[PDB]
Design a protein around this ligand. Structure first.
Ligand code: BLA
Ligand code: CL
Ligand code: CL
Length: 243
């Protein structure tokens, strides 16, 4: 569950990943949660082929506004730590997609990504999100990274950095907390949309998932531990299921 107290991975993960996992779990803890059953009720898996072992822990929930909320922690061998999180919105409410991805090695966090990603056909966040996000101001980060082409799905507020130091790690985590606070609040003030609008939002979410599946960074890690067929099933059915 979300206490993370029973996590075998948590104690061994990069400190920024630990703080983000805690912040996400704390954001969700008091929501009207129900468990979301993943395919094969996956909650914990390990695999190895010729190289290092991959270990994954999944914690997945749903609420009336979020069809599926995944907080996944993973580790390859002793080096490589990963946090994956997506809140998949229920299209009826028209909320954007919260996501973040953190990858860390022995030399520190290599990649930190977070976004509230659009589902509207115009590729814009809803007005209230645009207002609340603009009010946060532009955060300063020394080592910005350019998104790959499939990353067109991310909003203009997307963060993609290599944190330079602890101050930046903490600034990034605080901005994710700010995104979550906005998202939670908007989830209370959102109404059921029209059938045509619900359809538009569903289409945006489907596109997001199809584009995320183009990420070979994820795919290679999965393939090196479990092989091609397993990785394809995991990406298309567990991580980024097309609704
Ligand atoms: C088993 C799960 C899982 C694995 C194995 C994983 C691996 C992974 N993701 C990466 C990058 C990345 N990850 C993302 C983004 C995301 N990825 C997401 O899963 C989500 C929800 C977003 C955004 C909200 C982007 C944009 C990159 C950079 C891709 C690139 O450089 O080509 C990288 C490269 C890190 C680096 O270049 O420093 C690895 C190894 N991420 C995972 O989540
Ligand atoms: Cl691409
Ligand atoms: Cl390699």
């Amino acid at each position: 569950d979300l206490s993370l107290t029973n996590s075998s991975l948590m104690p061994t993960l990069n400190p920024m990943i630990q703080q983000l996992a805690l912040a996400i779990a704390a954001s969700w803890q008091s929501l009207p949660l129900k468990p979301y059953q993943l395919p094969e009720d996956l909650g914990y898996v390990e695999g190895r082929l010729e190289g290092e072992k991959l270990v994954i822990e999944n914690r997945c929930y749903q609420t009336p506004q979020f069809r599926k909320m995944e907080l996944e922690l993973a580790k390859v061998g002793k080096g490589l730590d990963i946090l994956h999180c997506v809140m998949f919105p229920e299209p009826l409410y028209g909320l954007p997609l919260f996501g973040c991805d953190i990858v860390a090695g022995p030399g520190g966090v290599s990649a930190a990504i977070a976004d509230l990603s659009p589902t509207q056909s115009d590729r814009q966040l809803p007005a209230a999100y645009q207002k609340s996000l603009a009010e946060l101001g532009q955060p300063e980060f020394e080592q910005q990274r350019e998104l790959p082409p499939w990353g067109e799905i991310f909003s203009e507020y997307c963060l993609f950095i290599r944190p330079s130091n602890v101050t930046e790690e903490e600034r990034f985590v605080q901005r994710v907390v700010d995104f979550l606070q906005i998202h939670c609040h908007q989830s209370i003030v959102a109404e059921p949309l029209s059938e045509a609008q619900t359809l538009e939002h569903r289409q945006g979410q489907i596109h997001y998932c199809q584009q995320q599946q183009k990420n070979d960074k994820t795919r290679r890690v999965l393939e090196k531990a479990f092989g091609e067929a397993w990785a394809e099933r995991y990406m298309s059915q567990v991580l980024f299921d097309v609704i």
